[model samples]
Target chain A: AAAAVAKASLFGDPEPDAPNEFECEDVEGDGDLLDGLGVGLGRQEMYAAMLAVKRLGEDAKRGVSTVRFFGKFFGTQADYYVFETTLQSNPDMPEAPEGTIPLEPYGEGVNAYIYFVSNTLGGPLQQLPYVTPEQIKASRLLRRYLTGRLDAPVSAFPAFPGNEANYLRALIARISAATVCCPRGFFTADDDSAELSANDEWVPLKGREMALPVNWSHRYAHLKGQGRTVTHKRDPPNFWTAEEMEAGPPPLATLDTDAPLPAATGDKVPPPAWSPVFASASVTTRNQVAGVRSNRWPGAVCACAGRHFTSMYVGWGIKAGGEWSPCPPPPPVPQWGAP
Target chain B: LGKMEYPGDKFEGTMEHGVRTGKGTYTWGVSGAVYTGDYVNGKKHGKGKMVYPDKGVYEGDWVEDVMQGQGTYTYPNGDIYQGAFWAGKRHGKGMYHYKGPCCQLVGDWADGGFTYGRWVYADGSMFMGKFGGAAADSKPTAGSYFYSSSSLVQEGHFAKDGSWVGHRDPAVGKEF
Candidate 1:
């Protein structure tokens, strides 16, 4: 088994020429692929993920962090990279290869900014239009939360009591548990539409949990790279929807392996017909409430609106699913305002 | 035994003396929803499956034509509710799954809003809380994240411990 290493850089002033480019290569027979790093997004999404990394580097206000970049089996010779980033980190870091993205340092104080993806669809990432505050002004609480002002929003309570903080916690819990219900790499959008039904979908067959590989990682602030292979047996991996069996199973994976690298006729594979993209990006704040809005970028993944404490990631699509009405058509982007 | 047409609905179930009775299948012509289960007099009762024209389906218990007792209702939009039902609404305990977004509202449900339970978001985050009233209500009297999230009110009316950060509406209880 072979292992590849990633570099962790120092956190400081913004990099004017931060690399937006991502190039994949074979590192012998790497065994440590997508390991240790808590799972969120996966391969076929890394292209936009690279742009997202570029966006983070462009914003100097955000602090030092750790990121994961890896590829999953997409098509015949397919699959792309999709990564997750954390804004907080421990001071020390392990050294990664010059071009590799480093993994997370071992430390944490509950991450203030975390993004969740509800589902996956194979297709080009949907580019949503930017939405304005006025479009959702009907929701005063939502507006305030997005502006980083809404606090102690009301909610029902129980055993102990409930407050805005409790609501947010519950919200995240609901998001995380979704993975257990619907495992990763199960669906994809069929075309370029951001809507779910439009995306190509698939299901995983029932099987015992198995050890997977570590893909890639990076840190804006860190010195070196030390590594270890971590694996655990869990529940069955993602399977297609059983309740909705009539929809049939999703498209099966073309490649499934512990190690994947660059392409040659026999060495590499191309992505699936409809690759699962980094769909949406978002940010949460110190405030107790959340305000969500879309982005102008076509490939933007998730959308988070909280205090200025921004953390972004991608997902399938973003829209109101509850009783709340869909936000009104957004006003044009404001040039002077910050994102 | 016989057939009866009422307004836009068609009933082809059991009939006693020209009245619907026993078991039968009622099909609504408007939406092309078909309910095949038990029948009492002329209304739906007992257990059955209602298939909607739009691809939504409800399979469970029924009483007097309305969804009652226990059952599972899957919406066309990928949302699913499986649990107790009263008068065709999600009442009592149930699980509401948002499939496309990949999450679920499981536990106590009142009329359709969350009463109390755990919310599992799509991103692998979890929160357990109890609400005093419905979700549409302006003020939910109960719930505590004293354990889950780190965000909180730094200053304001209903501020929790300062260790957490965010806005606080003292109007709400601060306990776990």
Candidate 2:
């Protein structure tokens, strides 16, 4: 209804038409209008097109993180590298966050996480940067299922702030009762890219770390919250880079005056909010790794799936007595942060 | 519907509401108000906008007469806090921002206290520590042992008792 539409607008939402790019006003363009079909008809038409993928009765898990990757062993070397990054960023950074690696044998239960952020296309389980050409293609296809008014029966949503997927993924990995594996600081999402893999051109990622400045690593986290509108057609100020936004298309909207104004009138302003969307881990621990890259290389890459499995040790090797609980405060360029 | 009413003093005279209430289109009001989401029962019930009343607008979900629950709340002055909440306040987990109060905080809130993490502000200032207590929109919350001046401080882990553990970084003003 008009009230719902207006409610969606005020409560911060991407345009209905163009779900991919974030934008505020639908008047400008969001979901493709039903055209000639008359007003508010697009939604009606869209709903009619949706069909349940599993009409046969088998429940289908979402395909968002279906694009899974695994790394074998994240040598202490990789852990040390990330630990150093943390220290460099904040001198007062805590020691490697503490947590018992899931695997009992210590190096067994590696970790893997799956986060879902609703995206214009598919649920943003993985960021656009992490998407491989195949993934991009697959993701686009997956996204289509979300279009025209159908909740994904087998689809994942793009995380609101895409990068937050890392946190959610990490949280899931830690609690998974499965002994597959996970690590405290070894959540690498090397999509078998040439950069992370050292070679493999069909994809051409920028560099090692799969996140080097000259390459794509710098642009990996896709959550945009740069004092700009969440519906910015462009990237949020925080996510903008000197180069990324340069080569990318200009954001349809901007933080300045370019920000879209509500096309609706005060009369359209609906009632206040009721349920906003957000999430968090059940527990807050210093021992956490997010959308990360462990040192697992092409060698240990799982043949079935081409991802590093360094996090295997965290969730599996269940053990006792290495109690290093999360201690969340410190002395550094102080601000707030999670472990 | 309003005009459909028969004109008979007791029967019907006229009524007024938000311009876009019944048949009219909702046009612009103040270009600057911070809105949350919609409005219901006189309060920002469903999804409301603040327009800052003047500064900006915070549009998102609301609970009984309060900004409780999840949604995005934008500051007219250029800050935003989006995430979860408890009873009419910022509780549970969520993300908060104030230019660079440290970084974009993504953590838990309880009363005036917050325990979580944040990224360096877009302006390049930062802190990533846990905190506790304060009014939702007013006053500073309590901080444990936070460090921001990377230069003057040493990067390392400290026990609850302030004892140094391991992973020490070069002290500020100190050479590698």
Candidate 3:
């Protein structure tokens, strides 16, 4: 059992006594492919429910895009792959892709992914910001069920630096799957503060496109090993911004005759306040929309079941075409994404 | 139970002569995963439970050192697969249970894949229909389609290519 616990610790919230949010019920129930009609809920309904479910702004964009991507319809959108795949590859960036949304930083100096790193890899990196209030409530309810079992710490994790999204996504999938199933998990119309509904207290999200900041791309053009470096001696090189970390680790400098360190071994010496670019950032594209808003508001508004009919459509749609397939990739930014 | 050690495996169980041939457990030292269950002729050939190095657990029948019969697989996150296991993949009949944002799939399995089945979401809506190709983590592939029922009794249909063909019960159509 000790061995079992350690193995599970690698992938999720490793707190030993954490309790499960919902009682994971087993439905020994009954249960598509299509062409252009590939799998996915209609854009409007899915998007609306996303709002109903408490995913705000950037989280909603990434969440919806991730749902569509896993369901195989994300490629249908213009430059969707160009933006998504690139972001998945590199979480830290000077700017998000021109036609894509990016994850908001959790705090001034903390990355959006600090919660996952601290939980999955237990170490001296203790300070972590809760990316969302929902996540905090979620952590309390989901602590038990999410005791991770991956065994490896963040640094030694196989996909450590680049592919952090995949593992984090898997953890998110687990949590979301458990939440919507519980009795208290789903929010009814009377819940007052944040009811899950389409026809009530909801506004349709307008669809539009935006580009990376003007200075974003050109500033870190050398990330993909392409541009010339322009060094700055100003400010002694602060290492705080997410974009700055992506360009590469800031060069190390020795602290000035640092005195005795506080709370240290007798032989220990004082040191600089070190916060390196130890981890990268990325969002996962897994099927976590199963029971999102299941059994909440009226009709389409409350279709947040874990793996129900509407949820089934969250990712899959059937379409026809032997010769005619989806359109080719758009050519705006230089295509350096992996095939 | 006796302790037996291999290059990268540690076993503590019953033995016949000098070989592990009966009931016992084997803990793979490399991955640190432990498998406890029935054994025959030094191979896992009966009921057993395997705690994966990653977050999940598998408990079921084993044949010739492989999962070859009925079993239940519970993922660390809340996904669970219970049904037939052919060698390893979910082959034969089974049900995949998901939660948080709940989804469930019950279907027939063959050739190391889910051939066809009925899928239900937690919203009291579902798709009872046909499918194509193998499962990607148990998801539908290209050329697969279904007859969706907004509610359990009412029915909606879609062509093989996923275009909306039509609906059955008018009451069911009202919600959409």
lDDT (0-100) at residue A330 of candidate 1? 14
**Every candidate's TM-score, chain A alone:** 0.22, 0.16, 0.18
The CAPRI category of model 1 is incorrect
**Best-first order by lDDT:** 1, 3, 2
Model 1 error, position A177 (Å): 35
Instruction: Write candidate 3's Cα lDDT for A173-197 as tens digits.
Output: 3222221121121223334431233
Model 2: residues >4 Å from true position, as ranges?
A: A1-339, B1-44, B100-102, B119-127, B135-176
lDDT minimum window of 10 residues, candidate 1 chain A: A210-219
Cα miss at A282, model 2 (Å)? 73
What DockQ results for candidate 2? 0.02
**Residue-wise C-alpha lDDT for candidate 1, range A151-209, written one tens digit per residue:** 34322111112333332322222222111111233334345532223223534322112
lDDT (tens digit, per residue) of candidate 3 on B62-168: 99887788998887666777899885767788887764445567788664545577665554344455544252333343222221322324444434443343454
In model 2, chain B matches the true chain B with a TM-score of 0.49
DockQ of each candidate relative to the true complex = 0.02, 0.02, 0.01
- What is the overall TM-score of model 3 with all chains considered together? 0.35
lDDT, candidate 2, B1-176, per-residue tens? 24322232111112246211222112234342223244444344555544433444445666654666676655544667777756545667776665422345566666534555543433333334444334222212332223332333334444554334535554444211
- Please tell me what DockQ candidate 1 reaches: 0.02
Which of candidates 2 and 3 is the stronger one according to DockQ?
2
Point to the candidate with the largest TM-score: 3
Q: On residues A273-301, what C-alpha lDDT tens digit does candidate 2 reach at each position? A: 11111111432532221222111111110
Candidate 3 or 1, higher DockQ: 1
